Amino acid sequence: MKLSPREIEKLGLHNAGYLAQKRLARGLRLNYTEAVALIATQIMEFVRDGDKTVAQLMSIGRELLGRRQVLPAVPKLVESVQVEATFPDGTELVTIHDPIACENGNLELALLGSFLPVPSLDKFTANDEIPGEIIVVGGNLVLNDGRKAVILKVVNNGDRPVQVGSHYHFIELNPYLTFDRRKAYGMRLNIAAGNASRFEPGEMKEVLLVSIGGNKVIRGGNAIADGPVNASNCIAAMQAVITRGFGHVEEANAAEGQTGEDASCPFTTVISREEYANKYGPTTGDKIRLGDTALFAEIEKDFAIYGDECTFGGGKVIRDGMGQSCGHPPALSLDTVITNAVIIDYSGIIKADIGIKDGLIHSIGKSGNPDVMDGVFQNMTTGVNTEVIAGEGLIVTAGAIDCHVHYICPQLVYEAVTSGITTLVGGGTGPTAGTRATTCTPAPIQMKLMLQSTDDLPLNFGFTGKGNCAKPDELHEIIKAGAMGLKLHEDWGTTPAAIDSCLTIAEQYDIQVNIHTDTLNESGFVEHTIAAFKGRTIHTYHSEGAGGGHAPDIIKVCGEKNVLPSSTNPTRPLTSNTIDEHVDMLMVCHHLDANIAEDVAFSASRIREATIAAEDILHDMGAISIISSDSQAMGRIGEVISRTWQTADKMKSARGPLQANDNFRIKRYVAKYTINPAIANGFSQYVGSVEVGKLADLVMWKPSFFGAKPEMVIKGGEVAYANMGDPNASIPTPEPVKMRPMYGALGKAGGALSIAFVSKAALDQRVKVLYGLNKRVEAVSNVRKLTKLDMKLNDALPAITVDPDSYTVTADGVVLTCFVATTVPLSRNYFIF
């Protein structure tokens, strides 16, 4: 067949269209992803047919799927569908804008060529009554306040169209524009940042002009006015306007004033507020729905000075001498700037530009060019050598940090970065019985190997050794080998002697001990394990206990001041299939028989509606501090994030507010998979939040898709993984769009962008040198003095009791009960399976 890569991909794209076709023929209302596959598929077939033109398919594409055939979110999610295909006259791109352009679509034509029977309308469910919606504050904003202004007559005396951008130095225009160049000096158009005024030939326009800001230095254009704006450089600019024949007619009468903050001043320009949000993303006071949950983030603070937003594009703000600076010291140009980002982070929900330099977050604030804009500090300069990532309209969060990882297969890893995870902490050596049960890389040899193995992968990694020992001898050795933490697991024995010996070691080496307690209470009940801690810091894995631990009351640990507790994600939150799923899962993992009395007894003592109900609550209480995966050993690598928000959505709806928005809850939760996993494992100075000085491990989200599928993953300053469409296409957006590794994932780059975490003792010996690692290696620290109070926004310490028969959990005297949710957001709307 001589298949090229594009041909192979489109075959997959087709197979997705056909699956979506089968579902539609069954009268299922399609989700976003289904609608897209279906439409691109038909477009390619119509092209194969050879009967229809691009312009035709542009209309036909709008009349395939109608409101009736799609889920309630779809008409807002599907802005359009793009695909390219081989027409009789070669490859051409078809964009279908607003494909749900009607009520009934055209079923026959949506199935045509599939040989699937065409369903009738009544087979489809009836329409129900907007993910990531921006709720705008009512009103307008005056742009560019506090600035000298002028209105001038401008004429295009040229024979071709001339168009001028919002930030272009007006005196520097095409010499065929005639106006009062002397009045134009130091001015630019007073229009929304990033747009333009178009002059057709012969046209006369009355333009509002406003003074440039900052230092007021003019650079670029035609070099008419090179220099700081002052009476002496004005005179020179006028000389050059005369000499060089730049169009100039004095306008002695021109109206002059400034941009006052009052109503009906003819010099000012206002932007409708809903329109501002749409151009530049939301600002102070606006609210953003997280995905299709019920959660709303309100912008708490904006660094923008209205009118000077950093927007990059033809005619736009980020251009030589305008928003892009020219002349500052070259060493301080930002490497990358993320423009107009909403940042959601434990420390605050805000609007800011983000500056990246040397793989680190260099600054957060108002970025641009100090020569032409007010409010630009020296660490926020967009320069010639600065790359732009456009965050307008998007949310930025830190990279998630999964701290319960089983290295069972390399694919867990791609599934993790693709969901928005950039750090993994756990143990393992591949798909062995030991690694499938425990987060343990047991041998020094295997430490070396897993660090070498993962050396090119663009994620930070930590590996943990087997902590189960009643003597310190081999524990010393695994930490010296490079383990950054030890796991105590019942499957290797988690007895009080092992627990003591392991924590005594942790005190010596400053590493975190993660524990999965003795479910069998073989050696002691939970009291006895808590006693064995002896007041020492310990991270308790899946503290609720479905995933393992003292039956039925391990959950009590969420009330011990020296315990840092996490949940794994499959029990998050309590929904209608939870209990059934987990019992079987338990039966399968433990090789138990549904027909043996005690097998069923162990199982019912492990999987407990009362405790899982209690976990939803303590999670919302801030009594459990971290959410993690348990990847492929009872948990799901790609769902650390979605399950966190799913939990938060269900509690919003069940409980009282936490402090006219959801900020407090939003922040409390985001900290569960960002900052708290980094604090507990001892590397919070490097990662875990969007703060200056840390790695630029940053995830870009569309609000409509937030907490389900991110757009882009930036690893240490460089895009590592992202949604990408047809590599042959004229743009990156045509189908099939899927999460793909980017340039940060190839060759040597993954290593250059990431950290491997080890113990200080291993770094003392330079295991980075011994192991021939190209990834940066650093030591974990500051972990033996943590208490629950060091967990950001999740420091609650209830007195917990658990009834040994009813399993009922009581926290601070209150009986914890919660309902079984029938559905969750961030699921049916997003996934193809």
Add this chain to the structure above:
Amino acid sequence: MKLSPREIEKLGLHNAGYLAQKRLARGLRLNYTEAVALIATQIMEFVRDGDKTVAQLMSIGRELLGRRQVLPAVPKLVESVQVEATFPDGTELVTIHDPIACENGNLELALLGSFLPVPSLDKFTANDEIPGEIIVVGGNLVLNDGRKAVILKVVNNGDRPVQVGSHYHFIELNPYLTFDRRKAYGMRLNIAAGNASRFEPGEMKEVLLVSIGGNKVIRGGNAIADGPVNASNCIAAMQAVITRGFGHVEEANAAEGQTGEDASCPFTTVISREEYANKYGPTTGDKIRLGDTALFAEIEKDFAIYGDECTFGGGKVIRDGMGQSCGHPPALSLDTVITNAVIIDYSGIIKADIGIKDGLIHSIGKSGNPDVMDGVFQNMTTGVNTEVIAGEGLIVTAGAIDCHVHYICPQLVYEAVTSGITTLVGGGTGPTAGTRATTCTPAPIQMKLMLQSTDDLPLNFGFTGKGNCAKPDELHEIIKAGAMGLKLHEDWGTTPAAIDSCLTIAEQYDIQVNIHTDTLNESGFVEHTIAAFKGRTIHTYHSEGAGGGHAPDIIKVCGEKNVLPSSTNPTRPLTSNTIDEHVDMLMVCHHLDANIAEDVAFSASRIREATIAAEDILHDMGAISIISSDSQAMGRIGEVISRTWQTADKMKSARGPLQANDNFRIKRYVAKYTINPAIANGFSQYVGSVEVGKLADLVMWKPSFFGAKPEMVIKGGEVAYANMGDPNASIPTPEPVKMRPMYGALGKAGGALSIAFVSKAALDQRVKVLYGLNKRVEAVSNVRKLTKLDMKLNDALPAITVDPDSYTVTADGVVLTCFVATTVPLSRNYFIF
């Protein structure tokens, strides 16, 4: 399921068969690729059934698809379909030879198992009336002229069959062949190079024998005649024939003469000319259709000496002591030889062997063994240590060079090599807003990263920095970092000041400046940008302007002596969907509204039938020198080649001939994506043509598929990427055949085979050492003194005017108008989507 890789692939192969099944049920005539998927798919199902044998499926496979069900090219393209499947008695290979063995096929049976309704014949279109056809000159060729000859009686007195190859030293035969060994001395069979005479036991044959050539030294076989042919070694050979019992009866009467160039001489052997082309590919005077275009390449020169062609195989020419030399100094053996290649290259369309040594093209000419063949120079020796790539019947061209690349995703890269591209030049850092708009890698840090990132990929790479600056400060820095060129883009500001400052830098560092001009004429019209050049060399990207630049007349630059101009590929050539596609594409990339007067005004001023029509012509004129992609930023990485030939096919058909063949046009065009991109960027001594001393970046084509899908990509002397079938199969050709990376793409090999291009200043500092690069690094040079006259075969300099209202283009007084083609070759016949 425990799926092995082969099982996974065949699932894809199946999905392709079924898609081809759906298309057939709609009464679409299938192309090549569809016919193949369909047939292999059914063969695998029949095997699953377990009812039919290999021999059956060999017949059944011929009776599925008939002439009626396929496109006009298919019966010549599909020589056969191979697949392997698990029969009741294990895996077996089925070859279907000439699958279109009839007129109607058997629809029911071609769909059987698909549960698709079987269409009737009249649903299919009516048959229309051969891609890569060889047009043979009429006549015969006498082999081996000018040589001593003899006819001898030969008898096989052995009890088993004996067969002798064309070049075997006849005296060295099996001792059971009886003949006059003394007459046989120094002789070999006078038959076509590469075949044989078979002697069944007891058989008597009258064989034409001809003298060996060159030095006439015998080596190998039985060592009967070891040594140079002379009266003294004859005597020794006769001694050994007697001693060792090699069959010998004197033939005192044998006819003796030589191979005279006249008619009816009984010693000579002629080869029918059509048959010669089929065995060894075309020779001087023959013509070859390029793919399914209307273009014909005529062989201008052949290095072969008829009768001594280098063909490798059982019984064939390339064997120890015959065509493979034995005894020359070992250091001068070729590493690889490409045998019997048609070379199409700006510098000539010829027939030659190609010698590779140390990753470089070592020689072009008549290759072989100087001991036994005339005309073999010392730099053309096929030796023991020489690999063979068999080019008989195939076309070889240089690796394409794409010099407008946006590094948006790593997949662009695989799509490029798989289409026949081996060098990429552009800018970017991944899927960011800046890289999606411009070919800019802006930060020094990102230079380091992209060079490290792409270090294992088997292509040469050049990265370009952001040239948009009114000061040189940061430009110095990006070039010192390793940028090999700078891009001026309007999106970063392409003002006369930036243009001057950037070109002044280019004069210092000897790097090329690529420009996308100010579309908005914000700062000046085209005149003003041309003035800002100040007579300095500059590469203008998409010079026509749909892709960007001064509206509506950027095209004027194709008439400036210091401008090197390129086109991007999506506007190539003007076809019926072109304008509709581009307007929307423009609307999408610029976020414009179909319902706003000035959005639609900008768009209509950018996308122009008159200028795109003019581009077809100036392209054919040799007024635009290069064709490039604009990969994923208005252009298509895998179509640089096809779009070049598509343009050439349309002009052949519209305009006058250019100088009874299409050689002049063919050469003019091939130079657009080979030699001219390397000259303009400053590395033409390394790559860009099939000439001695340059890298062996070479692409092997089947003429039937030329300019659509190549067979094989050789990177620096080693196969890097190629069509490959089922990795489990007994041969490499069974389905699914698809373009796959080869051994030149794994581990360390990509780096060993390729070049990363930087500025001389960066190499002065050893960025190759600093960046830890395993790829060879070299500096670009010889770029600040280029004029349009340095563009091979594309040096035309029309006086151009453009009407500012009608957009009509005039070149040298002639109004440029061209028709809108409804179709293009190198599309429907080749692609599955």
Add this chain to the structure above:
Amino acid sequence: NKYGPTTGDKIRLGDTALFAEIEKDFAIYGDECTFGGGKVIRDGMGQSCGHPPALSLDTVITNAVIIDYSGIIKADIGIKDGLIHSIGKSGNPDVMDGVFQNMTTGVNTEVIAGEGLIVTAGAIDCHVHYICPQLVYEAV
């Protein structure tokens, strides 16, 4: 005596009878590049401040008499990236006439004082027997 000889002066080669006459001088009298306390090569004076950082010379050899097959001259020599970047009058274009953009003494420029000395190319010996490594030390 202060700055080494200038055009027209002659210099005895060692204790031979050979005299080398300065054929050409790039110095503009009074702006010689001399480094030291109170001397010329100081911030904002002879040492430039504000030119693009990438073009500062790595090292300047000041006031050298160059003897070479191609001429006997007086010149400053600028070195950049291990290479000879320029030969001429060096210093600070903000304060001195005649300083081209490839001869800037900047903050990040080291100084080797040639005043009163001769500079020549390193010698190249093309009949070497590698008998012992110590030949090498004796050579350099």
Add this chain to the structure above:
Amino acid sequence: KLADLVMWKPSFFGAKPEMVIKGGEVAYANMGDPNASIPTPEPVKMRPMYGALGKAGGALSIAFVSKAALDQRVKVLYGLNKRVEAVSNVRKLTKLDMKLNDALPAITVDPDSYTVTADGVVLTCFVATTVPLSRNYFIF
């Protein structure tokens, strides 16, 4: 070209140089007492400098090979840290390509007397009793 450069005192030119610059960095030089308050106190002798320590020698210099060897990347094969370049432009040289030394006399030599004649002129030269650049400079 490489800044391979030797500084001389005119009083010592052609006998003993001050300083050897290799690729822009001082490789070897006269150096006195390492413990002293200045570099000039005794014993002053030629010693390797920072350009001759560790990895520096390699960063500052070139190993020259044939183009064929470089085509194979013997720099990579051999693990060299020194820059490697190919020699070239040697097969078309004649005596006329030697700067300032392109003379081509007709030479005859008498097989018994050994007398050399160049362009007709008998070549005879006196036997010098002394040479410069010796007794004034060397301790042995």
